[PDB]
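Example complex used in Figure S2.
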Amino acid sequence: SFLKEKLAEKIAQHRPRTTRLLKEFGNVKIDEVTISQAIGGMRGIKSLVTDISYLDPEEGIRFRGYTIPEVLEKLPKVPGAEMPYVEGHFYLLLTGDVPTEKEVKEVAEEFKKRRALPEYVKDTLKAMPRDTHPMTMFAAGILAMQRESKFAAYYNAGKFNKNTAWEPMFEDAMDLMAKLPSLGAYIYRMKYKSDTHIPSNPDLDLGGDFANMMGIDKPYDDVARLYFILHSDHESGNVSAHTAHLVASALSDAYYAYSAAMCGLAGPLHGLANQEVLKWIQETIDKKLGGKVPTKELSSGQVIPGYGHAVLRKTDPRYVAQREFALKHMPDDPIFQVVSMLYEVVPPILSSLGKVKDPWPNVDAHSGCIQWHYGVVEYDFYTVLFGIGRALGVLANLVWDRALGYAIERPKSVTTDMLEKWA
Amino acid sequence: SFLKEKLAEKIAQHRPRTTRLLKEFGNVKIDEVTISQAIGGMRGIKSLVTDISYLDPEEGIRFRGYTIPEVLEKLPKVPGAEMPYVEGHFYLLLTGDVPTEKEVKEVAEEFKKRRALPEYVKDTLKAMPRDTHPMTMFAAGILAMQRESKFAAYYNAGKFNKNTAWEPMFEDAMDLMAKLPSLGAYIYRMKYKSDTHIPSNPDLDLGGDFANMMGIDKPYDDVARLYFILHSDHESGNVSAHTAHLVASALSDAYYAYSAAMCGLAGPLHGLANQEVLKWIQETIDKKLGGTLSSGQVIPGYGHAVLRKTDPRYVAQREFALKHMPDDPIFQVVSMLYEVVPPILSSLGKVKDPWPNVDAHSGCIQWHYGVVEYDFYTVLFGIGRALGVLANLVWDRALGYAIERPKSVTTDMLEKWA
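Predicted assembly (841 residues):
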């Protein structure tokens, strides 16, 4: 039954595997590091270990072994809706199993019990000037809830033990995951919807209650459920997941670690392409066509936004599931198409006369037409949506990093004199 | 001569070197990754580049080529005190040049102009529950000041340019560094000294004003100066520095980047060893010895991970203690531990760095001067570490260092390697 008991069974079956490759295969070589890689942000160096998800350059992301069609197919659906319980995806990332209906319900019930926001989080967000960026408010909100950390309290009481430490990390992860959508919504209401608030509906699932607190009708409940699942994890080497992993490595709790992660996610080179693409599509539609649309669509120097990726070498399956959503739900939205027609024309053109390493769209090419369609026009808030989604993966990963006793992350620096001497 | 113009000259000298390394020697191998190192937190992998400082395993941290004795000897001193202007250290980290008295005075004037704490920072910290840990307050306050970021308004205004991006990063670094001591002190006063406050003295230097705002008399001004300089940087691969570096590499501003860093620095394996040493010394004084052991039990303040000999930061702290508090009981145990612990640790073989690090030594100094509030010690560390981390962010942007984005593998994939 219990998620926690189940997670403990998988931890007991996983630890020996880690012990064995440390005992017996510690020195097997896995990759090299070149100068180019040291200077250019450890690009492509195989230096991190996670089992939550794995980023294949050719296949894109798999979550616990499964592809996106598979996860979306298999996970149990919210009654009255198209999309899975986001809570069942959390169950998957934590355990490796597809939960049954009985199992998802338990996680939905436990989220219903933990989802309420502390008042002082709202106080803290009111004392922060209202013109503060929404990601700053989001990061701050998570950070203030550090006061509640069971992991920090268990550590402070002297009770730390490398076999048990995953347990209060789990408890924090459940508390935080349950609350993040309500935090995001509070920020949305308070910045953009006249500071009027819609109370939590204690009968809704995570994604449904999110749509509810946001003030947005059906089928935005499904848009969110899908959005969050697709952004749940992109292995551990992306900036935000890696930041949480890194901070967590020092035994900082999930509140510290996830707040830090949102600081990295806020970066223009990680959290902004959804909005940067949407803006570029609307500015193209308005100035470089009439309203219009049709055929005949770089070389003067500018990139196509939302095409390319540091690790993806083919089409993002996160992108493809958003395409399937828009086809079903908003065929004739003008900004979808343009999106659709960019899917057609851009990849030949980027390849046919090449130089980019991944022609092919990433999800950020597709996410903003869908949000914009349903009246989420507040560009800056898109990255908060990403932060809520990504915690599903990141906090799973932190429970696991503690479960397996992963060591403090601490590579070695060299100087440019040293690199110059190498030559 | 102006700091910014000298930094500009330094950047223009340095850039072509980085450029030539990538164009001509891109593929020169510098290291290996093993299964052990992927699982063991990248231990030993040479995968980061910084010039602010370099941690040498044997004879330890160097700041822009200089040792700690060299830095403490050469930097201009605050008129009438023992220790350097912290601002001169900052100048050194940013430029590579030891400032003259005239150059440090210009940095100190700039710091006095940028020192003031936004009143909404105070509002934010009072809305936070007063029982909040001072590190959480510290990171929240930095984070809230993200509203003021010149780098972020620069980015948002469409003005990002690869050559010029360091400029607004520099302006943020000066703003934040000038404020961190004041943010620190305000946390100290609001939490532990009855929420009564001592105003900034506009004629004092960074370290002197910090001790003034803390409410602690001379020579805590020199304690602080020394503390901050010693804690200023430990190359870029420590958790706090690396966190900043990582976050900034996605072109997040310094406020986001340094707040993230303090989330790292608050971890028990990173910012707590000062306090853990002190507590363990005070327990050992009281109940275990009024006024060796093998089993279980680690000796706090003695390992490292990169250091394999005596940390020179520990040595600098010791030389301050020998001078100002020779017969402080707690410092006498610390001194006795430096004699007795290393022989016992090295010959007996378990720990790879059988020697003190600076966390063995910082607590007795702070406790001696009336800073009894253990949790606050990490805030001190955070104030100081900003000196090298912010200088490192300016340079990361000056040199166009790309998004940090390593590749993950699974345990199935590691098992396949065999």
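Chain B has 19 helices and five strands. The two ends of chain B are 59 Å apart (CA to CA).
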